[PDB]
Amino acid sequence: PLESQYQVGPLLGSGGFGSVYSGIRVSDNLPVAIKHVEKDRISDWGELPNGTRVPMEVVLLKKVSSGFSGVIRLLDWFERPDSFVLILERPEPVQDLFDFITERGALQEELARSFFWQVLEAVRHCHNCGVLHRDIKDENILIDLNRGELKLIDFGSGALLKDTVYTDFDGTRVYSPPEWIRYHRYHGRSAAVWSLGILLYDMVCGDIPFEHDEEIIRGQVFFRQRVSSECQHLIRWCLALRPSDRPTFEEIQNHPWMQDVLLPQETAEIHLHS
Ligand SMILES: O=c1[nH]cnc2c1sc1c(Cl)ccc(Cl)c12
Numbered sequence: 001p002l003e004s005q006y007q008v009g010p011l012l013g014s015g016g017f018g019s020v021y022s023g024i025r026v027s028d029n030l031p032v033a034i035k036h037v038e039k040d041r042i043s044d045w046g047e048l049p050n051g052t053r054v055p056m057e058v059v060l061l062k063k064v065s066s067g068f069s070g071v072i073r074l075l076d077w078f079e080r081p082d083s084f085v086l087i088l089e090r091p092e093p094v095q096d097l098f099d100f101i102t103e104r105g106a107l108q109e110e111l112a113r114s115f116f117w118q119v120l121e122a123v124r125h126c127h128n129c130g131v132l133h134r135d136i137k138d139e140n141i142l143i144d145l146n147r148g149e150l151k152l153i154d155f156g157s158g159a160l161l162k163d164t165v166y167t168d169f170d171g172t173r174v175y176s177p178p179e180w181i182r183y184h185r186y187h188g189r190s191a192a193v194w195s196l197g198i199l200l201y202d203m204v205c206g207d208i209p210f211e212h213d214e215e216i217i218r219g220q221v222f223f224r225q226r227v228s229s230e231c232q233h234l235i236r237w238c239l240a241l242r243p244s245d246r247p248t249f250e251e252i253q254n255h256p257w258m259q260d261v262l263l264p265q266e267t268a269e270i271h272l273h274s
Contacts, residue, residue: 017154035086060155070122091144098138106206114262118150132161132188135171136195148268190243197238230257
């Protein structure tokens with residue numbers, strides 16, 4: 001044990017999630033990301049199937065790590081006196097969706113469809129595993145640029161999925177539903193669907209629809225870019241003011257805008273230029 005196991009490269013990012021470095025597993029030259037989180041910046045703690053005091057983020061990542069490639073998988077973790085260190089898979093080359101949208105602007109609908117579909121599969125996988133992400137947004141999605149595959153990251157604001165009301169939240173406010181803003185109360189699935197509507201709008205328009213609380217509460221969607229009526233309808237459906245008026249995951253994936261999605265590799269070859 002100990003970081004004789006890993007060679008450390010450049011800082012890849014830092015923010016609310018901690019600090020993430022590029023890394024190489026010395027053992028087999030596996031590319032990895034190395035994420036440092038300060039103990040004092042951790043509020044939510046859980047314990048393992050084993051039963052040790054770990055950050056909730058480790059509990060959640062363990063529950064979603066395995067066969068599916070929709071989430072960036074936890075390979076290992078270490079405790080330090082003042083911090084935890086997490087070793088995560090690193091696709092190469094990779095770009096986060098926020099940066100991809102910054103570089104390219106509003107996405108063509110065919111591309112947004114494939115991207116949005118993969119996000120839905122990823123979020124469904126988390127929920128099936130009993131994990132609520134609570135911070136779905138472009139900054140928390142990585143693109144494996146050669147494979148055309150999207151991967152969910154930073155579960156540091158998430159929770160165990162439950163069927164009762166959540167009264168806490170520490171994700172991104174501008175992706176948070178009106179019921180959180182007004183009442184400080186939400187249910188996990190319908191909150192997630194709201195965040196998915198914001199993300200979808202973000203993809204086809206090149207920015208998020210709401211910046212202020214009053215915009216969120218009003219729920220009035222203005223399309224700033226040319227977007228098909230089918231896409232507008234799905235977006236408007238996801239952004240329903242009443243949580244029960246929002247579509248289920250099945251209803252989203254069965255929507256006419258979602259039909260005939262590109263395969264990931266088709267997506268990379270057409271849009272990411274493989
Ligand atoms: O978990 C993460 N949080 C924040 N950033 C990242 C991760 S993984 C990862 C990988 Cl693999 C490549 C590049 C970045 Cl910036 C991140």
